Enzyme design. Sequence first.
Site, PDB file in Angstrom:
ATOM      1  N   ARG A 263      20.395  55.845  45.824  1.00 14.91           N
ATOM      2  CA  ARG A 263      20.977  55.205  44.866  1.00 14.91           C
ATOM      3  C   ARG A 263      20.714  56.057  43.536  1.00 14.91           C
ATOM      4  O   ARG A 263      19.935  57.010  43.737  1.00 14.91           O
ATOM      5  CB  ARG A 263      20.727  53.907  44.535  1.00 14.91           C
ATOM      6  CG  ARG A 263      19.194  53.641  44.620  1.00 14.91           C
ATOM      7  CD  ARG A 263      18.843  52.201  44.221  1.00 14.91           C
ATOM      8  NE  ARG A 263      17.667  51.700  44.127  1.00 14.91           N
ATOM      9  CZ  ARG A 263      16.484  52.176  43.597  1.00 14.91           C
ATOM     10  NH1 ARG A 263      16.574  53.263  42.573  1.00 14.91           N
ATOM     11  NH2 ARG A 263      15.166  51.710  43.756  1.00 14.91           N
TER      12      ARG A 263
ATOM     13  N   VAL B 231      16.769  54.619  38.296  1.00  6.91           N
ATOM     14  CA  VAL B 231      16.552  54.164  36.972  1.00  6.91           C
ATOM     15  C   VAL B 231      16.371  55.371  36.002  1.00  6.91           C
ATOM     16  O   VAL B 231      16.542  55.507  34.986  1.00  6.91           O
ATOM     17  CB  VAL B 231      15.733  52.939  36.942  1.00  6.91           C
ATOM     18  CG1 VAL B 231      15.925  52.288  35.841  1.00  6.91           C
ATOM     19  CG2 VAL B 231      16.294  51.854  37.929  1.00  6.91           C
TER      20      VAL B 231
ATOM     21  N   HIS C 245       2.674  48.421  40.864  1.00  3.57           N
ATOM     22  CA  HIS C 245       3.513  49.411  41.902  1.00  3.57           C
ATOM     23  C   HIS C 245       4.807  49.635  41.186  1.00  3.57           C
ATOM     24  O   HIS C 245       5.899  50.201  41.816  1.00  3.57           O
ATOM     25  CB  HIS C 245       3.956  48.990  43.340  1.00  3.57           C
ATOM     26  CG  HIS C 245       2.378  48.969  43.975  1.00  3.57           C
ATOM     27  ND1 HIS C 245       1.662  50.001  44.229  1.00  3.57           N
ATOM     28  CD2 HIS C 245       1.545  47.766  44.233  1.00  3.57           C
ATOM     29  CE1 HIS C 245       0.608  49.635  44.942  1.00  3.57           C
ATOM     30  NE2 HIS C 245       0.480  48.571  44.795  1.00  3.57           N
TER      31      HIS C 245
ATOM     32  N   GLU D 249      11.031  60.242  47.665  1.00  6.56           N
ATOM     33  CA  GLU D 249       9.570  59.986  47.196  1.00  6.56           C
ATOM     34  C   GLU D 249       8.515  60.651  47.954  1.00  6.56           C
ATOM     35  O   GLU D 249       8.652  60.895  49.041  1.00  6.56           O
ATOM     36  CB  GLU D 249       9.289  58.328  47.130  1.00  6.56           C
ATOM     37  CG  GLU D 249      10.463  57.774  46.313  1.00  6.56           C
ATOM     38  CD  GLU D 249      10.090  56.044  45.897  1.00  6.56           C
ATOM     39  OE1 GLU D 249       8.667  55.917  46.107  1.00  6.56           O
ATOM     40  OE2 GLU D 249      10.738  55.381  45.473  1.00  6.56           O
TER      41      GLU D 249
ATOM     42  N   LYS E 269       7.188  51.172  37.894  1.00  6.02           N
ATOM     43  CA  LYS E 269       7.075  52.427  36.954  1.00  6.02           C
ATOM     44  C   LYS E 269       7.243  51.439  35.387  1.00  6.02           C
ATOM     45  O   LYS E 269       8.061  50.922  35.216  1.00  6.02           O
ATOM     46  CB  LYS E 269       7.901  53.266  37.160  1.00  6.02           C
ATOM     47  CG  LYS E 269       8.164  53.962  38.685  1.00  6.02           C
ATOM     48  CD  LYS E 269       9.136  54.911  39.089  1.00  6.02           C
ATOM     49  CE  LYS E 269       9.137  54.999  40.572  1.00  6.02           C
ATOM     50  NZ  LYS E 269      10.512  55.904  40.898  1.00  6.02           N
TER      51      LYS E 269
HETATM   52  N1  ADP Z   1       0.910  54.616  51.544  1.00  9.24           N
HETATM   53  C1  ADP Z   1       0.719  54.254  50.176  1.00  9.24           C
HETATM   54  N2  ADP Z   1      -0.603  54.814  49.457  1.00  9.24           N
HETATM   55  C2  ADP Z   1      -0.675  54.481  48.147  1.00  9.24           C
HETATM   56  N3  ADP Z   1       0.179  54.143  47.363  1.00  9.24           N
HETATM   57  C3  ADP Z   1       1.197  53.609  47.818  1.00  9.24           C
HETATM   58  C4  ADP Z   1       1.791  53.568  49.308  1.00  9.24           C
HETATM   59  N4  ADP Z   1       3.051  53.245  49.414  1.00  9.24           N
HETATM   60  C5  ADP Z   1       3.367  52.797  48.322  1.00  9.24           C
HETATM   61  N5  ADP Z   1       2.535  53.041  47.362  1.00  9.24           N
HETATM   62  C6  ADP Z   1       2.626  52.647  45.913  1.00  9.24           C
HETATM   63  O1  ADP Z   1       3.494  51.662  45.832  1.00  9.24           O
HETATM   64  C7  ADP Z   1       4.662  52.440  45.092  1.00  9.24           C
HETATM   65  C8  ADP Z   1       5.927  52.015  45.454  1.00  9.24           C
HETATM   66  O2  ADP Z   1       6.116  52.022  46.945  1.00  9.24           O
HETATM   67  P1  ADP Z   1       7.448  52.028  47.548  1.00  9.24           P
HETATM   68  O3  ADP Z   1       7.426  52.434  49.109  1.00  9.24           O
HETATM   69  O4  ADP Z   1       8.479  53.129  47.033  1.00  9.24           O
HETATM   70  O5  ADP Z   1       7.808  50.465  47.424  1.00  9.24           O
HETATM   71  P2  ADP Z   1       9.160  49.785  46.493  1.00  9.24           P
HETATM   72  O6  ADP Z   1      10.122  49.726  47.761  1.00  9.24           O
HETATM   73  O7  ADP Z   1       8.829  48.358  46.247  1.00  9.24           O
HETATM   74  O8  ADP Z   1       9.411  50.932  45.424  1.00  9.24           O
HETATM   75  C9  ADP Z   1       4.660  53.817  45.201  1.00  9.24           C
HETATM   76  O9  ADP Z   1       5.007  54.553  43.849  1.00  9.24           O
HETATM   77  C10 ADP Z   1       2.857  54.003  45.005  1.00  9.24           C
HETATM   78  O10 ADP Z   1       2.483  53.697  43.911  1.00  9.24           O
HETATM   79 MG    MG Z   2      10.162  53.119  45.775  1.00 11.63          MG
END
Ligand code: ADP
Ligand code: MG
EC number: 6.3.4.14
Lengths: 57, 77, 77, 449, 449
Positions: E292, E295, E236, E276, E238
């Site tokens: 923020r 990155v 999860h 996002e 990048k």
């Molecule tokens: N509802 C969802 N369905 C599918 N993938 C998800 C979902 N929520 C998060 N992800 C995966 O996790 C990644 C990070 O989610 P995010 O909520 O931005 O968490 P973080 O705060 O750890 O960055 C997303 O880019 C996606 O790939």
């Molecule tokens: Mg995120």
Amino acid sequence: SWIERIKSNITPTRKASIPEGVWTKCDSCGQVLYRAELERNLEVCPKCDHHMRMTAR
Amino acid sequence: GHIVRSPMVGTFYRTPSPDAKAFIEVGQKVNVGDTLCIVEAMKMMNQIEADKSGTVKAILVESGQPVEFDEPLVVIE
Amino acid sequence: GHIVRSPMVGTFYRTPSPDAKAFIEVGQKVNVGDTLCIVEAMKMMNQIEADKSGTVKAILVESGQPVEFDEPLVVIE
Amino acid sequence: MLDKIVIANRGEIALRILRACKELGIKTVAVHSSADRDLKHVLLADETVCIGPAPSVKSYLNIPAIISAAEITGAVAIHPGYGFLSENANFAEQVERSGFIFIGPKAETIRLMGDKVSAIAAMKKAGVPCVPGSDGPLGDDMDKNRAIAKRIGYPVIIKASGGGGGRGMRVVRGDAELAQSISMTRAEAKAAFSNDMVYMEKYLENPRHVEIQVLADGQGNAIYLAERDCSMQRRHQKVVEEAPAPGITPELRRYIGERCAKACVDIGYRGAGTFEFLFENGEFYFIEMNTRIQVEHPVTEMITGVDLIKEQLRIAAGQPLSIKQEEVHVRGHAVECRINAEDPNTFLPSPGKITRFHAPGGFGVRWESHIYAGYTVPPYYDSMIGKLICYGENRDVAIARMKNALQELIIDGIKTNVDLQIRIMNDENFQHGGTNIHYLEKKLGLQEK
Amino acid sequence: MLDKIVIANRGEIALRILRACKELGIKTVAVHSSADRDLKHVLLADETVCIGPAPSVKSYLNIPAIISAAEITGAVAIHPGYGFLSENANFAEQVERSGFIFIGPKAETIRLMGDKVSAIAAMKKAGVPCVPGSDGPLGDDMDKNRAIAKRIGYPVIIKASGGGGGRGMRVVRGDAELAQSISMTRAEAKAAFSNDMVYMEKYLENPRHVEIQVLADGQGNAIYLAERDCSMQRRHQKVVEEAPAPGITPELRRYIGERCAKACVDIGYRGAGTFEFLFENGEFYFIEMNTRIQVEHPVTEMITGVDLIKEQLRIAAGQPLSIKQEEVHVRGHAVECRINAEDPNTFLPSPGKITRFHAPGGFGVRWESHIYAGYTVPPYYDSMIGKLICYGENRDVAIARMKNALQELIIDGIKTNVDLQIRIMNDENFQHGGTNIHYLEKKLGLQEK
Ligand SMILES: Nc1ncnc2c1ncn2[C@@H]1O[C@H](COP(=O)(O)OP(=O)(O)O)[C@@H](O)[C@H]1O
Ligand SMILES: [Mg+2]
Ligand SMILES: Nc1ncnc2c1ncn2[C@@H]1O[C@H](COP(=O)(O)OP(=O)(O)O)[C@@H](O)[C@H]1O
Ligand SMILES: *C(=O)CCCC[C@@H]1SC[C@@H]2NC(=O)N[C@@H]21
Ligand SMILES: *C(=O)CCCC[C@@H]1SC[C@@H]2NC(=O)N[C@@H]21
Ligand SMILES: [Mg+2]
Ligand SMILES: [Zn+2]
């Protein structure tokens, strides 16, 4: 690490076709020359200035 | 010992003709003034001449493989 | 010997009051439990305490000059 | 598209061409000397060929060796880059007849334009303004020479028409030494460029070096990119470029670009070239044309987004110009500061081994060089060891980014001209923009008691 | 304009902020730890302050120490960058009340948006589409949880609303472990983010990570830059970004940018943030907002020419937005490939000493890092050791330039993830553009006999 790379051999065989009548040799010096250039320089090897044969006409 | 190196860059050969005998042979010694191989460039087959006499220790090249300047071709002891 | 270092970052002083006497003096020895200088931060003057007894060899800091973590302030032999 | 070409050069431009070839998917052929067996582009190439010993005359100026290397590897084109065989018309003729493709102008145009007097005559024929002058090499009559000089107006300068490279030209202040100066300039031209032709031209005291990069496919298409400005010259050689230039409003930009395009159409030009000029109170004076990829090419790519080497490789492949006049957009500003391994003050080359190297990096910084940790600078060729650009949104931003990069940039082990670059950046007149060509020399000053 | 600010961060982003400050003429304050006393930006700064020992908790998470450093040096603002105290709302409140200026959103918006459930509720209030789900932390009733899951449709996922950083979330496949998974996710959220709130949301199997960067001054102005795409994620997190994304036609781009601008106007947002989303067959699903400087910011600067940090420094100075909606132009494409000092396969950090370093350089290559020859990587913080971009004219050009740069790029002495980057670049589906988020995991595969 491309910094430490060995030199591999060039392709063993590739079909290259330079025209045959555009290069001569000078045994006096060894510098390969352009035939048309040499003929335009009154049959004088421009590198070592060593005269060669010339047709009477 | 001494190793002959081609002063030019081009196609390499051992027989001056498509069907002929190589200039030198491994084993049997060679002298200072002798032709050992052909390094052809622009379809102008030039000759390669050693500079020291001695026994042909080994041949480090193979026919038809292009070589360049400062390339050890044949070692003479 | 042992040199005391400020564990915080802020303004440095030697007298706890604008017009008073410094906590310690060069020369005369000091003990393990004693206050030697003030390193003020956010207008909250905190005290600096050594950990080894010995003679005050020299003082490497001057009043009003900010210092930071791991900064040798006073050397004790 | 050219299936496989040959990098007929060495060093920075060789690496740049190699990167562009790998970008476009064209394979690579590396030709090098015996001293430059650890060049960056040589190590980053599939096929490496050594065509001579250390000296330039035996290795890189050995046209038979280059053609032999291009024959053995099976290439169908050769890229000369700048320097060495960039403007050798006979090299172009031989490569054309040898069975390959010359990436650049046709040899006829090379002959017509490389010789300065012929280039000026052709430019006047095409209507491009030129410096009033002799318009022909002068003889041994001092009376004729001084009459022509008075006609054009003193001071005057004698320059080798087949000359170049910041040498082979002498400035004349008065008739007390005109004949001797002309004769010694002719002798220098004989010793350098194998030609005795020397001519007289009007000499200016307050010029502004303005040059325009242009492109043409030779098929009735001629496009011009943005301008340039190399006001900071040392010994007539550039040290700090910038593009576009201050004060040149878009009206004048279009006005001179149309004329340059018409000139390229009339001459039937092909490849990447630049029409130099001299700028003063709205007047342009053509003096020379560089029929090659100019060294200060990046300061035009970054302000237009068009890769010059990609353009050359497409034109040499026969493809028509993919970019039109309205499809060129000037967006920004740039500065470039070459890095050389010379002595900062005495201008003596300082070859050796590099101990510590570190690129600037950052937004808008583009560091073109081949030097690396442990790379031994050979004492055999030009003293350039890298180019450096800092593309900004305006001139002040570019200068600030250049200052930051120069602070970041570290080259240790050999003498470098970074200190002079810092001093140039710190100058107020330089930061203002629009200094004269001699400004650098005025800042140089002279001897002391 | 902020006369002097504080770099409340370390490493790559610290160096980038330092360069931007020196560009804009703003002086520099460097705050560092005792282990990072040879950082590049620390050495390239006027004032260096050490505010703790090696551990992060005592040195960089020591808000009193940062405020003390900002008081002694006389700064009037602080830049957190990303990570550490980027989203600490209490940090923003303290800095606002301490007498300085927080470069970022107001603490109220930080509280409203950082908590994921509140952010989703606010987005739905503003009309921005969101993933259907619980819309609230669920209790200890398994019947209610499974009823909600059936309402939204299995599979479902439990994510910590105060969570982040790729952890604190568990995916649920069936009701046989729903309660235990929720409880252990709550425990992990307690152990990491000091909050037990966990919620349920619809889980998708074939998403496309699409995110839009936006800017607002908090004075009724809201502009949106181009999109992004981070389809290549690992755990999860990048690893390879790109911007703009394939398939997103300008119609959809404007359509979602207008909605994001309206959302920023309604929330009264300030600073640099990104909304996002999740993309599938034309549907966007907001899941989180990062208040923020993200990155993967460079892949938006190079395709628009707008420096994000300069925008933040101008907004924090109170100046209104100098760029309008029509004055933003999307011109190009980009790729970014982070470099980390981890183990290529086992993903174990490999700190130590760097022996040989060499930047790529070239047209369009922008190398953001602080590593150098002899720089000892500390075993105390994140494993990132640099970012790398290759701006092209289309996606294929960018990929080719990235391949060339990775060939050129050399980092020796410690383990690096360059090999994985090369493998990702060589993949055909990746070069095609438009892979799913799990694509990386499918290419990962699984155990073997
Ligand atoms: N509802 C969802 N369905 C599918 N993938 C998800 C979902 N929520 C998060 N992800 C995966 O996790 C990644 C990070 O989610 P995010 O909520 O931005 O968490 P973080 O705060 O750890 O960055 C997303 O880019 C996606 O790939
Ligand atoms: Mg995120
Ligand atoms: N007629 C002139 N008047 C003033 N300066 C000149 C003149 N011709 C050349 N120069 C100076 O010399 C530089 C190089 O001239 P150029 O003809 O391009 O020679 P080269 O072939 O050595 O580059 C110019 O940029 C300019 O600064
Ligand atoms: C030119 O067309 C090809 C002939 C080159 C030399 C020929 S081919 C191989 C033969 N053996 C040899 O040593 N040279 C002969
Ligand atoms: C706060 O407003 C300033 C007072 C800080 C301490 C004062 S100023 C210098 C005096 N000497 C000393 O050691 N501390 C006193
Ligand atoms: Mg010139
Ligand atoms: Zn000869």
